[PDB]
């Protein structure tokens, strides 16, 4: 039961990292586009 | 026992990714601030 609970919590932690990476990809793409345009 | 050991190792791998994302968020924020200031 502690193992299932750990996997559940780790999945939430994984989702947070996936969402964070998506945010950062969009932010650096916005910067690269700005610099290209300038 | 292999499952507990795998969850332990995966938690270390998750911590490394969380730390890495924090580093990158700070780096792109520093760049966005530089560009705003310029």
């Amino acid at each position: 039961n502690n193992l299932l609970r750990a996997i559940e919590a780790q999945q939430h932690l994984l989702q947070l990292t996936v969402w964070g990476i998506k945010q950062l990809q969009a932010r650096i793409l916005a910067v690269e586009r700005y610099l290209k345009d300038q | 026992n292999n499952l507990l050991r795998a969850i332990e190792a995966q938690q270390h791998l998750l911590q490394l990714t969380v730390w890495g994302i924090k580093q990158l968020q700070a780096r792109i924020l520093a760049v966005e601030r530089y560009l705003k200031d310029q």
């Binding site: 193992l3 609970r5 750990a6 947070l16 | 938690q11």
Partner: peptide, 29 residues
């Protein structure tokens, strides 16, 4: 859908909270 600074500080809190729980679960085992 662009997270601001406060949303990133909530992200950090939520990551700390899940990490603390997982540490306890793996120890308690």
């Amino acid at each position: 859908q662009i997270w601001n600074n406060m949303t990133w500080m909530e992200w950090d809190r939520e990551x700390n909270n899940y990490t603390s729980l997982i540490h306890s679960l793996i120890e308690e085992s």
